[PDB]
């Protein structure tokens, strides 16, 4: 289970870099409309 705990944090830190770019999308189409 020590391979499940080291992968969780990593995945969370990886996917949140790609969903921080979809939160920029919110600001941008709020001012565009």
């Amino acid at each position: 289970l020590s391979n499940v705990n080291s992968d969780i944090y990593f995945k969370l830190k990886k996917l949140e870099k790609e969903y921080e770019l979809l939160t920029l999308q919110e600001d941008y189409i709020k001012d565009e409309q």
């Binding site: 289970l1 705990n5 999308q25 189409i29």
Partner: protein, 39 residues
Amino acid sequence: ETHESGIKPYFEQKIQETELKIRSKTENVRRLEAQRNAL
């Protein structure tokens, strides 16, 4: 196996704050997509 289960929801608590956010933005940025599509 029981020592690795008590320090595992607190590795996961830091990542689950960003995760709840990301459930509500996703709905919210498709909410403003629909308004903007009709305009």
